[PDB]
Amino acid sequence: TTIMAVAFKGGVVLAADSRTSTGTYVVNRASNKLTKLAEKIYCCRSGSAADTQALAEQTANYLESYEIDTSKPVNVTTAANIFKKLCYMNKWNISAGIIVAGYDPLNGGSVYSIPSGGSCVKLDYALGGSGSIFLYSFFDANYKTGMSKEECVCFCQRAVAHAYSRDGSSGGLIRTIALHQGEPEDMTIPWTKTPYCMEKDPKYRDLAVQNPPFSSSAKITVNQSRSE
Amino acid sequence: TEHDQSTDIFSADGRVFQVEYACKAVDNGSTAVAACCTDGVVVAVEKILTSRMLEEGSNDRIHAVDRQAGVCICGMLPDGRAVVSRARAEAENSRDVFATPIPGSVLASRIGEFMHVYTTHYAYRPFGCSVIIASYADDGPQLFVSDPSGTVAGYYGIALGKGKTVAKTELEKLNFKSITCDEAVVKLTKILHDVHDKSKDKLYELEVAWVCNKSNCVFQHVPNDMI
């Protein structure tokens, strides 16, 4: 799994891959890991599918009740706090890394990270899942604050493509959603139009020379392609 | 006339007499007034002293329930103190679970719900206090009253207790859109000095509090020099 969320000027972008696997076999190649918690607040889910589905549903139930009781739309910080409490009270019996992100008019676009263990950290961007390890350096080199909404969608699509080209446990579609004061905008990129993969990178077109033909010299040239 | 022995029984006319009787305890208590300015809210209350030998602060009727909100009690003080505890617990729950300061309208509706439940069951009696709630959270300045029936309403200005009919007359000659929190303290105190009955209650003092911009939306007693 590869998940992330990034803040921009006046909102957030969430992004993910679409693969669910038992280790070496793909059970679903088109999962949806961006789960809605309220009109402008979403989470990204990693770890056990069963545990994350169950805690997202419970968090959403509590936010809907709260919103009816106050007659106002909820803030991102309230969703993060409710979710944190469920992750922390159940930490020994679950496998879950969560990112909560969204837009509200008090604080604008906000991103919170809730990793294994149940801590809660407020950031400018967050990464999660098996594929995150491939992206720390990509962001350290190429991320800046103050990107526009279109810059930020394009950047997150590229980041997800890099992680899934190297991580066997990620793959498939790239899903994104952008949350701001207007309406939410979702997008799905198919593998055939991915912005990066190893299979089409020209520096990996020519094969390594592992199988040189039997020769009278120690010079290494080409791979054998036909029987002698 | 057996219909007035418990709060779990309607009368033939559709009334609940135990709740009416509890309201009569509030109407015989000391007077309170409050006003909602553009800055904040001010509350003031009359304390009838029972001895000239009390320390200052004894039997206080005004209590903070969060950083930005407070309550004033009319009628029976120990009953009021049980409501203050409940309110403190609801404000804490809102910070701990939802990460917000409790909005004023929500605090008032929980206090109402709590008071109402004691008008339904043969084994409990209704509270003999009315509570004034004053708050300034993300929903602006707000002033509410909850009575022994559990009915809750919002006001620009209000008076309770035995001086209330006259005090109401004088709150109607204020301009609520324009007034500041320093003017309000002078006007509200004046109303309370004027309705005091000097025959019946010989010793008294005033207690005053506010929450406003000047105070940084912190609910507190006014410094004793401003009276």
PDB file of N, CA and C in Angstrom, chain A residues 15-18 156-158 160-161 164 171-176 187-191 194-195:
ATOM      1  N   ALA A  15      -4.024  10.789  -1.958  1.00  0.00           N
ATOM      2  CA  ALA A  15      -3.731   9.866  -3.061  1.00  0.00           C
ATOM      3  C   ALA A  15      -3.390   8.468  -2.587  1.00  0.00           C
ATOM      4  N   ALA A  16      -3.697   7.477  -3.415  1.00  0.00           N
ATOM      5  CA  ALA A  16      -3.389   6.093  -3.114  1.00  0.00           C
ATOM      6  C   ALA A  16      -3.277   5.226  -4.356  1.00  0.00           C
ATOM      7  N   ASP A  17      -2.728   4.014  -4.165  1.00  0.00           N
ATOM      8  CA  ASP A  17      -2.761   2.949  -5.162  1.00  0.00           C
ATOM      9  C   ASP A  17      -4.035   2.125  -4.958  1.00  0.00           C
ATOM     10  N   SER A  18      -4.276   1.055  -5.710  1.00  0.00           N
ATOM     11  CA  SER A  18      -5.538   0.318  -5.599  1.00  0.00           C
ATOM     12  C   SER A  18      -5.365  -1.177  -5.316  1.00  0.00           C
ATOM     13  N   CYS A 156       1.426  14.501  -6.553  1.00  0.00           N
ATOM     14  CA  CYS A 156       0.989  13.297  -5.885  1.00  0.00           C
ATOM     15  C   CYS A 156       0.799  12.132  -6.867  1.00  0.00           C
ATOM     16  N   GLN A 157       0.345  12.339  -8.099  1.00  0.00           N
ATOM     17  CA  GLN A 157       0.239  11.237  -9.056  1.00  0.00           C
ATOM     18  C   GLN A 157       1.625  10.646  -9.372  1.00  0.00           C
ATOM     19  N   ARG A 158       2.599  11.526  -9.527  1.00  0.00           N
ATOM     20  CA  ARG A 158       3.952  11.124  -9.842  1.00  0.00           C
ATOM     21  C   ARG A 158       4.582  10.378  -8.671  1.00  0.00           C
ATOM     22  N   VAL A 160       3.017   8.677  -6.357  1.00  0.00           N
ATOM     23  CA  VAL A 160       2.463   7.344  -6.239  1.00  0.00           C
ATOM     24  C   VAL A 160       3.047   6.419  -7.320  1.00  0.00           C
ATOM     25  N   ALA A 161       3.254   6.907  -8.540  1.00  0.00           N
ATOM     26  CA  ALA A 161       3.816   6.056  -9.578  1.00  0.00           C
ATOM     27  C   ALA A 161       5.227   5.586  -9.256  1.00  0.00           C
ATOM     28  N   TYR A 164       4.958   2.832  -6.571  1.00  0.00           N
ATOM     29  CA  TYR A 164       4.464   1.523  -6.930  1.00  0.00           C
ATOM     30  C   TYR A 164       5.328   0.809  -7.974  1.00  0.00           C
ATOM     31  N   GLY A 171       0.301  -1.255  -6.516  1.00  0.00           N
ATOM     32  CA  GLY A 171       0.119  -1.340  -7.951  1.00  0.00           C
ATOM     33  C   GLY A 171      -1.268  -0.857  -8.377  1.00  0.00           C
ATOM     34  N   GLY A 172      -1.566  -0.927  -9.680  1.00  0.00           N
ATOM     35  CA  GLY A 172      -2.934  -0.800 -10.187  1.00  0.00           C
ATOM     36  C   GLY A 172      -3.307   0.625 -10.561  1.00  0.00           C
ATOM     37  N   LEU A 173      -4.416   1.132 -10.038  1.00  0.00           N
ATOM     38  CA  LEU A 173      -4.870   2.474 -10.377  1.00  0.00           C
ATOM     39  C   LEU A 173      -4.236   3.483  -9.415  1.00  0.00           C
ATOM     40  N   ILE A 174      -4.168   4.752  -9.819  1.00  0.00           N
ATOM     41  CA  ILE A 174      -3.916   5.826  -8.871  1.00  0.00           C
ATOM     42  C   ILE A 174      -5.230   6.570  -8.639  1.00  0.00           C
ATOM     43  N   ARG A 175      -5.701   6.644  -7.394  1.00  0.00           N
ATOM     44  CA  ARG A 175      -6.893   7.421  -7.070  1.00  0.00           C
ATOM     45  C   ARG A 175      -6.482   8.683  -6.337  1.00  0.00           C
ATOM     46  N   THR A 176      -7.044   9.831  -6.697  1.00  0.00           N
ATOM     47  CA  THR A 176      -6.855  11.085  -5.962  1.00  0.00           C
ATOM     48  C   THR A 176      -8.165  11.770  -5.610  1.00  0.00           C
ATOM     49  N   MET A 187     -10.394  11.660  -8.990  1.00  0.00           N
ATOM     50  CA  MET A 187      -9.786  11.293 -10.262  1.00  0.00           C
ATOM     51  C   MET A 187      -9.178   9.890 -10.145  1.00  0.00           C
ATOM     52  N   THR A 188      -9.284   9.076 -11.208  1.00  0.00           N
ATOM     53  CA  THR A 188      -8.659   7.768 -11.286  1.00  0.00           C
ATOM     54  C   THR A 188      -7.807   7.638 -12.550  1.00  0.00           C
ATOM     55  N   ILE A 189      -6.479   7.443 -12.426  1.00  0.00           N
ATOM     56  CA  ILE A 189      -5.556   7.189 -13.533  1.00  0.00           C
ATOM     57  C   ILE A 189      -5.367   5.682 -13.712  1.00  0.00           C
ATOM     58  N   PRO A 190      -5.629   5.110 -14.896  1.00  0.00           N
ATOM     59  CA  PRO A 190      -5.283   3.706 -15.166  1.00  0.00           C
ATOM     60  C   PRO A 190      -3.795   3.443 -15.407  1.00  0.00           C
ATOM     61  N   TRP A 191      -3.337   2.210 -15.110  1.00  0.00           N
ATOM     62  CA  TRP A 191      -1.932   1.829 -15.221  1.00  0.00           C
ATOM     63  C   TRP A 191      -1.366   2.184 -16.597  1.00  0.00           C
ATOM     64  N   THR A 194      -0.049   5.733 -16.645  1.00  0.00           N
ATOM     65  CA  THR A 194       0.713   6.132 -15.473  1.00  0.00           C
ATOM     66  C   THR A 194       1.798   7.119 -15.904  1.00  0.00           C
ATOM     67  N   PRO A 195       2.113   8.176 -15.123  1.00  0.00           N
ATOM     68  CA  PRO A 195       3.218   9.084 -15.449  1.00  0.00           C
ATOM     69  C   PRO A 195       4.656   8.576 -15.243  1.00  0.00           C
TER      70      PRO A 195
END
